């Protein structure tokens, strides 16, 4: 089997991407944030505290003939941005882009944090990291990918995120029309439950390439590119008037600037992030200070290749017995 679904930016900045997902019988379609940095499929639901729902579409298990309470199971998750959610669990039929899993754990939110409530465009998350990170207790649950894997034509999914445009998540096949050149594969460590890999270095604009190992994760659920402070300082030093602002929470730059590109290494291959991808616009409405898309990881504990980086590539998440990542230009 295969599946193919279009993923659409939630706003003009590509802050996140939503993908429609069919849950239950008859289908209830929710728009979920596919997150390669977490392992829970959770949804706004009929159980979510009413004051914490503001415009999201909800899953109502009582209207699904295939929903079953997963008795005793609870979940609770905290993300890198300080957001959180928790609740109980149903199993139900879940389909993405024509690919169906029966008996998928659908984590029904009873509580969500303010950032989820305030984002009416995101109806929940679909985690695509390794199932070792799933938070369901007392019986950990599998991701949609892990449940689909054995049925797929190839044990892979691909992320093809757009810049200010829709893109695609494919399951079970590699669309050889969707990228240019060849795909460079690189090793993955699953020790932390992430798609963790080591970049071979970076360049700023037309500058020379610096060969240096940068361990980080491929995380579709993170907007920006978070790298070591040395690398980030080297990038923003090439933008007149750029500075790190403790008041704003990162590097800002004059909105009048033209940003340089940023290149990262994948083995001997190179992925170029155009300068425009690194512009996240005014820090507040009407400001002439703009927020940068490359930020320091120093306060995180891991480097994150988020959407800024991933949307410059066609990315293969190879879930074979030995997982690997692949990157191609596009």
Instruction: Say if residues 326 and 183 touch (Cβ distance below 8 Å).
Output: yes
Q: Could you give the CA distance from residue 326 to residue 183 in angstroms, rounded to a whole number?
A: 6
* Catalytic option among 33, 35, 119, 123: 35
Domain boundary among 174, 195, 218: 174
Same domain? 158 vs 296: no
Q: Could you give the CA distance from residue 218 to residue 307 in angstroms, rounded to a whole number?
A: 9
Instruction: Say if residues 122 and 54 touch (Cβ distance below 8 Å).
Output: no
Closest among 150, 145, 170, 152 to 160, alpha carbons compared = 170
Resolution of the deposited coordinates, in angstroms?
1.0
Q: Could you give the CA distance from residue 200 to residue 313 in angstroms, rounded to a whole number?
A: 16
Helices (H), the chain: 114-118, 144-148, 229-236, 307-310
CB atoms within 10 A of CB 306: 25
Closest among 308, 12, 57, 31 to 169, alpha carbons compared = 31
Biggest alpha carbon distance in the chain?
A: 60
Task: State how far Cα 274 lies from the chain centre.
Answer: 19
Same domain? 123 vs 34: yes
Q: Could you give the CA distance from residue 291 to residue 179 in angstroms, rounded to a whole number?
A: 29
| Long-range Cβ contact pairs of 80-86 (< 8 A, separation 24 or more) | 80/37, 80/222, 80/300, 80/304, 81/115, 82/113, 82/115, 83/113, 83/115, 83/116, 84/111, 84/112, 84/113, 85/42, 85/109, 85/111, 85/112, 85/113, 85/116, 86/110, 86/111
Same domain? 167 vs 180: no
Domain boundary among 174, 209, 234: 174
Same domain? 125 vs 199: no
Same domain? 104 vs 238: no
- As for how many domains the chain has, the answer is 2
Same domain? 161 vs 262: no
Residue with tokens 């005014």: 282
Q: Could you give the CA distance from residue 171 to residue 148 in angstroms, rounded to a whole number?
A: 9
Same domain? 132 vs 249: no
What is the Cβ-side half-sphere exposure of residue 216, based on CA atoms within 13 angstroms? 28
Check whether the bond before 6 is cis (ω within 30° of 0). Answer: no
For residue 300 the two structure tokens come to: 């995180």
Q: Is 1 a catalytic residue?
A: no
Same domain? 120 vs 185: no
* Catalytic option among 108, 199, 261, 296: 199
| CATH (domain of 323) | 2.40.70.10
Same domain? 145 vs 195: no
Residue with tokens 């990170």: 133
Q: How was this structure determined?
A: X-ray
Q: Is 35 a catalytic residue?
A: yes
Same domain? 146 vs 115: yes
Instruction: Say if residues 38 and 189 touch (Cβ distance below 8 Å).
Output: no
For residue 301 the two structure tokens come to: 């504990």
Domain boundary among 128, 145, 174: 174
Same domain? 158 vs 180: no
For residue 67 the two structure tokens come to: 């929903």
Instruction: Say if residues 206 and 196 touch (Cβ distance below 8 Å).
Output: no
Q: Name the 3-class secondary structure at 58.
A: coil
Same domain? 121 vs 248: no
What is the extent of the structural domain holding 315? Answer: 175-330
């Amino acid at each position: 089997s295969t599946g193919s679904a279009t993923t659409t930016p939630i706003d003009s900045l590509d802050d996140a991407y939503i993908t429609p997902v069919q849950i239950g019988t008859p289908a209830q379609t929710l728009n979920l944030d596919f997150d390669t940095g977490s392992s829970d499929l959770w949804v706004f639901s009929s159980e979510t505290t009413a004051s914490e729902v503001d415009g999201q579409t909800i899953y109502t298990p009582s209207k699904s003939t295939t929903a079953k309470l997963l008795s005793g199971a609870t979940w609770s998750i905290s993300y890198g941005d300080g957001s959180s959610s928790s609740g109980d669990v149903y199993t139900d039929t879940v389909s993405v882009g024509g690919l169906t899993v029966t008996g998928q754990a659908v984590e029904s939110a009873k509580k969500v944090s303010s950032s989820f409530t305030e984002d009416s465009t995101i109806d929940g998350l679909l985690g695509l990291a390794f199932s070792t990170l799933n938070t369901v207790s007392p019986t950990q649950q599998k991701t949609f990918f892990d449940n689909a894997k054995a049925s797929l034509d190839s044990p892979v999914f691909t992320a093809d995120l757009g810049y200010h445009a829709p893109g695609t998540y494919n399951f079970g096949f590699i669309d050889t029309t969707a990228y240019t050149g060849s795909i460079t594969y690189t090793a993955v460590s699953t020790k932390q439950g992430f798609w963790e890999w080591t970049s071979t270095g970076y360049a700023v604009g037309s500058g020379t390439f610096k060969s240096t190992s940068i361990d980080g994760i491929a995380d579709t659920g993170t907007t920006l590119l978070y790298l070591p402070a040395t690398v980030v300082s080297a990038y923003w030093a090439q933008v007149s008037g750029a500075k790190s602002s403790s008041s704003v929470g990162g590097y800002v730059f004059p909105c009048s600037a033209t940003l340089p590109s940023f290149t990262f290494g994948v083995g001997s291959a190179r992925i170029v992030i155009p300068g425009d991808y690194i512009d996240f616009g005014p820090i507040s409405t009407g400001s002439s200070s703009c927020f940068g898309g490359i930020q320091s990881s120093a306060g995180i504990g891991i480097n994150i290749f988020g959407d800024v980086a991933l949307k410059a590539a066609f990315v293969v998440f190879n879930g074979a017995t030995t997982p690997t990542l692949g990157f191609a230009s596009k």
